[PDB]
Every structure is written in structure tokens, then in C-alpha cells.
Design a binder for these strands. Sequence first.
RNA 1: AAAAGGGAUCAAGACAAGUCAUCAUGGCCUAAAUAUUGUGGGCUAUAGACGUGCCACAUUUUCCUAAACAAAGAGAUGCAAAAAUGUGAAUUUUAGCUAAUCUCAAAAAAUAGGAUAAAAAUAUACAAGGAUUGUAGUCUGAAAUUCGACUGCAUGAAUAAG
Lengths: 189, 156, 112, 103, 81, 118, 53, 19, 105, 134, 174
Amino acid sequence: EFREYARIAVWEMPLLSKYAKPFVPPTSEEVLRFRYTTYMGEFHPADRKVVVEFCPKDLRDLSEVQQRKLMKLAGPRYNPEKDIIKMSCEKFEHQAQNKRYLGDLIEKMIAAAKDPKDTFEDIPLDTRHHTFTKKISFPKEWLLTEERKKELEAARQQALLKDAEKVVQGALVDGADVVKQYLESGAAE
Amino acid sequence: HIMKVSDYRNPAFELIHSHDLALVKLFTDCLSGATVMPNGGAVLGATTRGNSPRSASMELAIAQREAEKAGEKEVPQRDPYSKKYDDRVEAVMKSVEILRLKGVSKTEARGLLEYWAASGMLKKRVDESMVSEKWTLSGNGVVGEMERASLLTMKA
Amino acid sequence: SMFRAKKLDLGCFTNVRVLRDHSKRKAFLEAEPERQALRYVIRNTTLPARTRAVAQLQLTQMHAYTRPTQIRNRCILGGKSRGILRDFKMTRYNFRMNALMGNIPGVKKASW
Amino acid sequence: APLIKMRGYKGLAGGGRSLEVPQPIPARQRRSTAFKWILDVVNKKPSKGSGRTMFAHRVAEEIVAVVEGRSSVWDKRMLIHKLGTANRANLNSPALQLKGKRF
Amino acid sequence: KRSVWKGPHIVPLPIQRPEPGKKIAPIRTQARSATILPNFVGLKFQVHNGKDYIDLTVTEEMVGHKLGEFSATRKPFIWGK
Amino acid sequence: VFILGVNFNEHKLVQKALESFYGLGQQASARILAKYSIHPRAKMGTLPPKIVTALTAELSTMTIENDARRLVLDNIKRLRDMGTYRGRRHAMGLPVRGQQTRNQIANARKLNKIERHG
Amino acid sequence: SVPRARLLQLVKARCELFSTTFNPEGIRTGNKILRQRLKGPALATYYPRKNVG
Amino acid sequence: DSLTDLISGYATENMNPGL
Amino acid sequence: GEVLVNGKTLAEYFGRVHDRESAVWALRATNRIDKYNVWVKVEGGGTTGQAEAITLAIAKALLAHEPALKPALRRAGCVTRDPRKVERKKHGHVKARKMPTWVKR
Amino acid sequence: AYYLGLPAFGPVPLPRMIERWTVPKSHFIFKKSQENFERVTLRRLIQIKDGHPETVQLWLAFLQKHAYYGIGMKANVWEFSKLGVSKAMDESKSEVEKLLETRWEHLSHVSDMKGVGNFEDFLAKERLRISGGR
Amino acid sequence: QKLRFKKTKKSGKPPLPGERKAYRKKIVLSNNNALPVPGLETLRPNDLAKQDNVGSVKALPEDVVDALRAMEAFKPTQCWGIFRQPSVLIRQETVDLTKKMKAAGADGKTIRMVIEGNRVTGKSLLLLQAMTHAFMNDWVVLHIPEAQELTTAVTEYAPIENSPLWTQPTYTLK
RNA sequence: AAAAGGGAUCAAGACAAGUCAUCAUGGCCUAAAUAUUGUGGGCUAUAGACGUGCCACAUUUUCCUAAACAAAGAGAUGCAAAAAUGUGAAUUUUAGCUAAUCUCAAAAAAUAGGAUAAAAAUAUACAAGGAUUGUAGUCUGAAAUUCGACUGCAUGAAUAAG
Ligand SMILES: Nc1ncnc2c1ncn2[C@@H]1O[C@H](COP(=O)(O)OP(=O)(O)OP(=O)(O)O)[C@@H](O)[C@H]1O
Ligand SMILES: [K+]
Ligand SMILES: [K+]
Ligand SMILES: [Mg+2]
Ligand SMILES: [Mg+2]
Ligand SMILES: [Mg+2]
Ligand SMILES: [Mg+2]
Ligand SMILES: [Mg+2]
Ligand SMILES: [Mg+2]
Ligand SMILES: [Mg+2]
Ligand SMILES: [Mg+2]
Ligand SMILES: [Mg+2]
Ligand SMILES: [Mg+2]
Ligand SMILES: [Mg+2]
Ligand SMILES: [Mg+2]
Ligand SMILES: [Mg+2]
Ligand SMILES: [Mg+2]
Ligand SMILES: [Mg+2]
Ligand SMILES: [Mg+2]
Ligand SMILES: [Mg+2]
């Protein structure tokens, strides 16, 4: 079997390069990003779902208020962190039908955001459905820069002076000896 | 405690507000400026982190006065969909100053560590290397945490 | 009785109760949409009190084979109903022997 | 802390009774037996106050009643020391040296 | 049906009101889970206890209970004799 | 003090005194105190005499003590007369709520009667 | 701090747009039985059918 | 207005085979 | 000497002074608390489990700066990786080792 | 993937899935002695970035035709498309019909196939039988 | 009849009322064993308002300890009974707060501020170092030791006629 | 890093050890019944007594408040967010995910404060405890009576560490 695959990788694989096509970036008009599932010869109930995700700011036909109304109608389908409206559909028997419904539904979401009847501006955008994550970062003040090295030398030298002047003046407290001397002087009765 | 609904029940079995209490209504008026002390003085309120509830209004007002004092036009605001706020607490803490306490400086930590050693309660050599050890174990000089590691320890 | 097929269509270990439980799965597959409608009219408090009482009386006349609670997995190799695993359709013991000999794919003795 | 420990040989004192014999114990065994006597007297005292210092201040008082020689653990120490003194001869007892030497 | 919002458990019973003064034989039933509705307060039932049919005369105090609550299935346990 | 003919010591919570009457619990007791502005931690020796008089008047109106045991004893007696399963269990002093009778039926035998303690 | 009567106007638009049941009163409409997917065909194919011998 | 007739209406004799 | 664990101060993360000292024991034994700033990030485990893990982390990081401190950290116990691990539960046993009541009769 | 110009990233070792069962060694009373069994599922992930939609489909076709025994595969495909999805699907019809001209030979049936009956209800229930029941 | 085995059925004077509560609330301010710190100076009426005193521990006057003890300024959570003479540190915030209190009462003004911080940052002791400056400068100190005694429903309360307010007679008396 | 640990495995033989109620099988028996099907009942009975478990008998416990730290496992026979309603069980309605992605999901003890004491034995101070029972509900399901699991209110047994 290894020889059967070594025969495919040496004689049949190179022919794949004759039918390949280069990748082209998506233009400004391609604003949707669909997802289709495959099980490679298997029949699974989950291979009928089609997910679609777009960005409200990709639709340049919608103004500010019209874009914010689209985030409200989206409901829990909106990700405030990433600013992407993700929505799926597995209502029908065929993937084609699940994609056509999402294609029409997005045309209604845009038609409802353009409706001047109610702009829902009074309603503040609710983000209770999303759990925001807080990321901690290394403090930039701790970076040992050539400038910070000078700041450390001053902090280490100013500490030796404080201890030095206290020792010269006989003031460096040593609780280990304060108790010893007191106990060894008949002061505790 | 006085910045929330109290635990008292009125004849209709309804919770009374902490500000409806005569005594609490006095300190609140003076703290907000309603009751003006003619001869002057000071109205200082101190929060507590031992057996204390969480009042979003007090914490919000605290954060709003610190932002204004720090010269920041992006002062925090209410959560438009939260129902844990109290309009009465917002008015009281509207024009009050704030004193944020934190760990004591390194110089202050020494003066306090030297007092514990001179009393025989800290049998250690109080030097810079030792003052910075307690200043680190106590969360950058938190006085209370500096005592748990120096006086209430099981090493001496 | 009337649900038992006149020609045996079972290819596994046949048994008095295995043949009985197979007839309840076929009877329920045909009457599940009908039984789901009766349970929807009973729980719909917007319908008249009479419509709910009619559906409540007809759901009682359904044959016991039509109830889904009568279905209980059985061992396709031994025909037992006590100690069955959904992942293999066999008893805990028949699963052990077949797993040791290698007749159950992927399963091995666990040690850690 | 006691300096000895009593260990008996089952059925070597005649009539089914055991032959008790003293033995010395290391420091860790001495301190454990000591502080376990204190906690036994503490748990039997009646409660006095409230707060978190209830148990701590109860043990500390027994530590002060020990240094003052007016604690009940001293009688528990002198009691196990009497056993050793009363059995200081069993170390060379005839029964021990004759387990199976009289076939 | 425990939950009140979906009515009581009703079963097809031949609960035909008697003609004035006519003699009606008691209703023999094995449906021990049939709630005692008010519509047959006064009729004579014969509930099945597994082996025998124990007669029952519904009253206004039995409304809400089940028919099986009045027919003992087991016999009292008595030690000795 | 005296509330409804029952004597209570000074060192006794009013919350616990009212809660000692058959039929009164943490719910009804909390509402009686709130009606007369009595903090839950109020002890017996602290109540003014007028307030004590009020409490007795309120308690008398309520369905408590003997009145509450009538409703409970009448329900058990009704189950016995009708001939229900539960009625037989109460009369014979056996578990009434579908419990295994092979062992551990002590509390049932001791308390289950047609005329309960309360 | 948003009026409940005003929030429903948005909750109502979503149902119309997404074709969902608008039940602001929480009435028992028995819709939980309609959302339940049938498990009949899954249970029927439990015992393998008689095959070639 | 009455639902009593439903019980007797659906009461088919010989419902339980035998008795 | 500023130590931050998960963006929080040593006293704000470890409420037990015993765990704070164990976390920075490597710097304490060598007398270098006031010469290094530690920014730690831990995951999994309990309070003490995380504290002991931070001890070995700072030690290894500290040896990158001053490799000559390994003999001292050796005697301080900040170089050894404690391999003790929670034992698994075993069939026929209530716990890893504990067994059910054995009835003779 | 290299010959097709697809930059592949991996194989990424995903967490192995472990199922566990503890069964008695005997078919009867002897329960004090049991033993553990498991079925560990080992999995990898090969993610392809910046890949042409059609080219990525030839890759998966080549892998299915030359699939190695004992391995199951699941591929999620992403693609960018413009608005007006419905209109595009209708226009493509004639493009797909021309490609199926020579592929219609695979399926052959009698005139007015009656065994099928309702077309959609057939596919719905035939897929259930093929897929084991779900 | 039941014939199983059943176990057979078979001290000092108790404390007085309020004794236990007063045990976990007593404040010990001196320790005879602790040594007297040499050079420990006392607080002058204006010591808490000098920037130079920052970082120095000064002793509280004996007469001020009785006043602070009268209004429950100290707390059992604080560690006062470990030393001989109650002395408090003078931190940077003590001067800021005191310097504002010195100018407020001087010009008939009123300062209203809140003290916030972490768990044991010293907020409660900062209040003590305001009351200390108040007693020494002839002020009227009206301190509410614990604000939870007014909210947790542990004291008597009665209403005021024709008003929504409520009084607390037992607390106002104390 | 290291003086590591655990799991599986553990023979022949004996105990005529267990299983003819998984399966399989020799002999002997039933074959209008010792076979097959449904409704209801029973396997859930209770004098005495024996086994394992849970929980409690307050002072290192329990109760109240607060802005900490896990692992593993489950969801195509389905895990269910957010929101709204209800004191509560739960309901209304479905976003997402068939999964290192989405959901179950929240760790608890702890740490730190706070409250309660003649905290049961002197009847005007009956502690802690949550069994038993009444009643009103909720969920699953034709169906909850014999005979289910949870929730509210009320009732408040023994129990002094054996
Ligand atoms: N300036 C100080 N001088 C001396 N000791 C101090 C000083 N500040 C705080 N302490 C001590 O620190 C510990 C905690 O101080 P404090 O009680 O004032 O904190 P807190 O903010 O009130 O805490 P909490 O929020 O829990 O009420 C006490 O032991 C206190 O004596
Ligand atoms: K009690
Ligand atoms: K029941
Ligand atoms: Mg505690
Ligand atoms: Mg028993
Ligand atoms: Mg464990
Ligand atoms: Mg405080
Ligand atoms: Mg070996
Ligand atoms: Mg063998
Ligand atoms: Mg035998
Ligand atoms: Mg045997
Ligand atoms: Mg046998
Ligand atoms: Mg056989
Ligand atoms: Mg049957
Ligand atoms: Mg059984
Ligand atoms: Mg409890
Ligand atoms: Mg929710
Ligand atoms: Mg769970
Ligand atoms: Mg006691
Ligand atoms: Mg015991």
C-alpha cells in the first residue's frame, strides 16, 4: 500500500498542478463569507447547515444609524468584540435551500435597516449576550531600556545612602538585638 | 451599607430605603450639600471591604468623580440595561471629593517596620533589602497585608 | 399481536421479547406524527376546552405499542434488556468479550 | 512530654494478662504525645467567649498553665512515669527470654 | 395529569345517566387512574383491584381523587393469626 | 410577658415567641412585627406594654393553634371515612407517602394517627 | 433603564424578520412539541433486518 | 358548554377484550 | 521588586501569606527581592498548587540571569520539580486507596 | 496541496477524544471485580489558507478517491460571495447544466417513475435509510 | 416487640448576658511585655498637618485615647494590643486630608469626601487620624462607628408622624 | 527534574465455588400449553431481626456578606445561551454549536470580615436537628391511585458522639 501511494505521489500528483488555479483576494463587493460542511462520502445530518458571516461596515449603502439598527435586529447574532454578524440555517433538507434562505434573509435585514419608520435610536445596543474577555499585557514600564537602566542605578544608589547614614548615626534598628540587650540588662524584672 | 435598600420592613411589608432613616438622612444631606453646616467642618465617609454589599451607584459615582478630577472627558456611565442602580445614591455622591488609598511608599514602610522592631515584635534587621521584601509581600505596601506578614506570623 | 409481522424481518438474535420490542418501534414510527399532534392540542391552552378533551381521550385509546415509553433497548446478541450500552447494542458482558477479541472497533483495555 | 512508652507483650504475664514494658521514645514521639494531651484537655473545657480566637486562646491558656505547673497534663505525665517505675524489672523478665526455649 | 393547566385525566367510561328511577348496574372499570369528576357524583362504580372488583359509591368528597385510591390492591399484613 | 395567655421570659426573641404558636412561621411572624415596627432581634423584655396588647389582638383574629389543628385533623378524618388508601395508612400507623416498609418506619408508627399531635 | 413597552417594538421586529413566534405574555402555546424533532426513524433502525444467509 | 357527553360518547362497548 | 500575578498584586491574588512567600521563595532565599520585577501568568490548579509552580518558574528564570545561584536554590528547594500527582480512583475502591466496608460473615 | 498551490498548515494534533466504560468481568453476581475499557480517538487538523474555492475541492476529491482505510474525514469549506445570492443561483443553472450533459447517463429510470412517487419525500426518507436512521 | 440494643440515656456556671459579645469586641491598646520605643514623640495639635512628619510614628495623647475609645474608633480587627503605647503612622494622605480640615474650619467651609481603597488599605484608621486632629483642635466629633447597625435591622425603629422618615431611638440614645 | 508513583497484568491446581435466567450445549420433560397477546395488579407488602449507605446530635460546627483558584467529562435518541415571567421548581422564546470554536457551566472548601449564647439540664430562657404529616403547585409521560423526581407554606420526631 505504501508503494501504491508512492506511485500516486510520483506520477499522478504532479498532474494536479495542471488544473490548479491561483488564489485571488475577494473584491469589495464580496462581503459575505459562507461555510459549507463536508464529510467526504458520508451521510451526516450536520452537512446541511450553512453558516454566513458578514460585517455591517462592509455594506457601504447603509449609513451610521442604519448600520446600528442592523446590529440591533441581528440580536445575539452580533459579536461586538469582532464586529461580525454570524448566522446559520439548517431548516431545510438541502444545503442549497439553507444558503438561499440566508441570502434572502440578509436582503431583509438590510431592507429593515433602511426602513425609516423606526430607527430604534432610543434603544441602546444590548451586549449582554456576549462575554467580553480582558487580555493582560506585559507592562511597558518594566522593559529594561537604556533609559530605565539609569533609573535603576539611581534607585539602587539612593538606597545605599539611606542605609549608610543610618548606620553611621547608629540608628539601623535590629529587633534581634533590641530584645537580646533588653533581656540581658535586668530590665524585664 | 447606607447606599442601598435597608432590611427594615414597613407596615405594608416593604423594604425601607437607607436614606429614609432619619439619622442616615442627616449624614446624607450633609454629604451631598443639602444641609449646609454654617460653622463649617468636614463630612468624611469611609467604605469597607469587610462585610459590605456592592452598590453599582456608589462605585459608579466614585469612578465618575475620579475621572472628572483626573481630567478625563470619557467619564464612565450607567449600564443602560442594568437594574441595580439607585438614583438617590447618584445625587448624594454627585459633588463629593475622593481619597483613594493604596500601599504606603517605601519610606513610610521603613518608619513603620522600625517601630515594630524597636518594640521587640519583629526580630529582624530593618534594612532596604528587608523593607522591600515586606513591600512586595503586602501588594506594593498595603499596610494591613504588611502586618499579617510581620506581626501575625507563626515564625516569631 | 396485530403488530407482529407475519414474516420475520429480524436478522439479529431473535427472542420472544426482542420480537415484541421490534414491533413497538415500527408501530411508533408510523404513529409518532399522529401522537405528536394529540400532545400538541392538549398543551395548547389557547384552544377550546372541548378540543383539548377530545385529543386527551383519543390519546388514551392508542394501543400500548404506539407509546414511545414502551421501547427499551435490547442486546442484539443475547436479547437481554438489563445492562445495555447504547453505543454497541449489547450487554456489558457481550461488549467485554467482543472487545477483547477485537470484534468492536477502537475499543481497548484502559489503564492509567 | 514523657520520656518512656509502655508496650505490652500479649499473654506473657500469666492468666491472660499482658507483660507491660517501658521503652524510650524519640523527640517527635515525645512532643506529639505531649501536645495531644493538651488538645484533649482543651476540647473538654467549657466555651468562654465568641469570635475566631475561641480555640486559639483556649490552647494558649493551657500552654501557660503548663509552665506554671498547675495543669492536668502534669498528672497524665507522672501517671505514665509510674508505670515504667513499677515495671522497670520486666525488661529482663523470665517469660520474655523463654518464648520457645522450653520445647 | 398532575399539572393543573392541562385538565384532569379523563378516560372513555360508559357513564350514562340513568333514566328516572331505572335500575343501573354498577360501572365495571379497570381504569384506576381516572380522576373522579363531578359529573358522576352519585353513581356506583366497581373498581378493579387486580383480582376483584370492589364497589364504590362516589360522593361529593371524592371529587379530585383517583378511582384506584378506593380499591386496596394488597391485603393488610398481620403477624401470626 | 404574656401574649395570648402564654408566658414568655424577658430573654426571648419576639420573633421566636410568635413562631411558637401552631400555624405561625417565619413568614407570618415577619409580617406581624413589621406591622408594629418591631425589629426581628427585639427581645421580650423590650416590648412596651401597649405593643404587647396589640400583638394579642392581632393573633386572636388569625387562624392559629386550635383552629389550625381542626383543618388538619378534619382532612385526615375525611380520608378515613371515604375509605381511601391514605386513610387506612393513618389509622394503622404506617407510612402514607409510598415508602418502603421493610425497615425504618419508626416515625410513621409513632406519629401517624387519625388524631395527630397537630 | 429602557421602557419595556419600547423594547417589545424591537423584539417584535426580530420575529417578523426571522419568522419567530412573538409571545410577549408567555402563554402556553404548545410550541415546545413543534420544535421537538421526531425520533421515530432513529429508533426503528435498531434491530438489523434479516439479510442474505 | 358541558364536556360530560364526550366521556360516554367515546365509551365503546367491548373496549377491553373480554371483561 | 514589583511582582504581578495574572495582572494582580501578590496580595490581591494570594490571600494566604504562606503562598506569597512560597511564590517568591527563590528571590527571598538569595536576597534578591529588591532587584527583579516578576510578571507571572498561571493557569490551572489551586492556590498552593499555583504558588509552588511559580516558585520553580522564577528559579529557572532567575538562573538565566545569575547561573551561579543554582547551588543556593538547590538547598532552598526551588529547583526540584515535585512530581506528586493526585492518584486516580480504582474500581472496587471508594477512592484511590480507600475500600468499602468488608463484611466477614 | 503543494502541487495544487494550496499552502497547508499542519498537521495540528487536536485533543484526543477518550470514551470510557467500566464493565463487570462476569455476566453474573461477581461485581466486586470490574475492568475499564476505552476508545481513544486520535485526530489531526490540516488548515488551508488563501486557497481557491475550486482548487480546494479538487484537493478533497483527490483525498477521498485515495482515502486510507481506517480514517474518517470532515472538511469545512469557506467561500466569499456577493449580495443577491438568489439571483446568482438562478443564473448559474445553464452553466451547471452544460457540465451535467455527459453526467446524466449515470441515472436511468423507466418513463414516469412511479416507485418514487413524491420526489422530495423520497430523498428525505431515502437519505434516512442510507444514513442508518439519522 | 422491639428488642434491639439502644444506648442508655445519661458543669460550671454559665456566663452572664452580653459577656460573650463583649469578649470578641474588647480593644486592648497596650502590651506590658512590649518594649518602650526610645524617642517616640507624642502628637502636637498640628503634628498631623506637617509634611515633614510624613513617615514617622507618633504616639496618641492619653486624653485622646479615651475620646477615641468612647466612640469606638478602634476595632478588634486592628492590632493595637501588640505594642505598649498606641501610635499611628503619618502617611502622605494623612497630611492631605488634615490640611483640608485645617482650612475648612478656618474659613467656615465644609469639605465632603469619600475614602475608598482596597481591603485593608487603612481607610478606617485614616478616619481616626481625622478625629484625632479634631479632638486636639477643639472640634465636635460626631462619629458613627459601624454603619451596618443602622441598616441590618438590629436596632429599634419607629416612624415619624406625617412623614416617610424613620427614627432609631435606641441608637440615637447610645 | 529524578531515592519517584500508579494502572493493567498475575500461573497450574483446588473449592463437583457461581452461572443450563446472557450465550451455547448432552440427556430428560411441556406441545390447546410448562407456548403466544392485551387490561389491571404485583416485584414497592411488614411483627421481630441482620447487612451495607446518607445525615444529624452548635463552640475548629452551622448562618450572613464579598470584586479568588480546578480538572475531567457530556450534546444527531440534543446540549441550550441571552432576554422576559414566577418567592420557587419552572415557564415563554430560540441565538449558536453537532463542537480545543457554541452550550451545559456555576467550582466548593478556602481567604477576609460580620451576626447570634445562661446557644438543651432551675418549665416565664425547650439548643441544633429536618424525620413524619397536611396543603397548594411544577416537570416527564396515554397514565404519577397503589407507585415517580423536584418547589412553596405549615407541621417539627428521635438524636447529649454511641
Ligand atoms: N497609618 C497607620 N498606622 C498604623 N497602623 C495602620 C495604619 N493604617 C492602617 N494600619 C493598620 O492596618 C490594619 C488595617 O487598617 P484599617 O483597619 O484602617 O483598614 P480598612 O480600610 O478599614 O479595612 P476594611 O475595608 O476591611 O474595613 C490595621 O491593623 C491598622 O492598624
Ligand atoms: K429549632
Ligand atoms: K404520588
Ligand atoms: Mg470564617
Ligand atoms: Mg437497618
Ligand atoms: Mg480527591
Ligand atoms: Mg474599615
Ligand atoms: Mg509483571
Ligand atoms: Mg487458573
Ligand atoms: Mg455445587
Ligand atoms: Mg462459597
Ligand atoms: Mg446453586
Ligand atoms: Mg435453556
Ligand atoms: Mg402487562
Ligand atoms: Mg427489588
Ligand atoms: Mg445543616
Ligand atoms: Mg437563562
Ligand atoms: Mg450540570
Ligand atoms: Mg451546647
Ligand atoms: Mg460513632
